Amino acid sequence: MKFQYKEEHSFEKRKAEGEKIRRKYPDRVPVIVEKAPKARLGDLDKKKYLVPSDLTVGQFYFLIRKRIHLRPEDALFFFVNNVIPPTSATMGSLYQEHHDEDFFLYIAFSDENVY
């Protein structure tokens, strides 16, 4: 998966921040959210989130949908490691299982279920 955020920050800088964030808040998780190339959607102002580990994936869908000014009828899909995570997962367990070596978790979003 390709992320602007990874290309615009040195990996060492990214890793040292993920690492300290996780030391300072073990009940929060650092997440990067970006639009997959050519989704037919607005993009997010804010890329970088520190979400409480108890928030569900379904509840984060909802905050990301507000931030891009979706109507409730428009589709949205998340992809972590090219896999669509379930809404019933917590952001904590999703982080534990799928975080980057830089200690961020990366989510791509689209209007399509693969694209």
Query: Could you count the other beta carbons within 10 Å of the beta carbon of residue 16?
Result: 13
* Six token digits for residue 56: 């569900």
Q: In what order do the strands lie in the sheet with 28-35?
A: 48-52, 28-35, 105-110, 77-79
Give the orientation angle of helix 57-67 with respect to helix 91-98, to 10 degrees: 100
Interatomic CA distance for residues 37 and 57, integer angstroms: 22
DSSP character string of 48-115: EEEEETTSBHHHHHHHHHHHTT--TTS--EEEBTTB---TTSBHHHHHHHH--TTS-EEEEEESSS--
Pairwise CA distance, residues 12 & 44, whole Å: 25
Q: Per CATH, is 1-115 categorized as 3.10.20.90?
A: yes
Residue 2 CA to residue 73 CA, distance in Å, equals 28
Cα separation of 40 and 43, whole Å? Answer: 9
Token couple for 11: 């990996």
Name the resolution in angstroms: 2.4
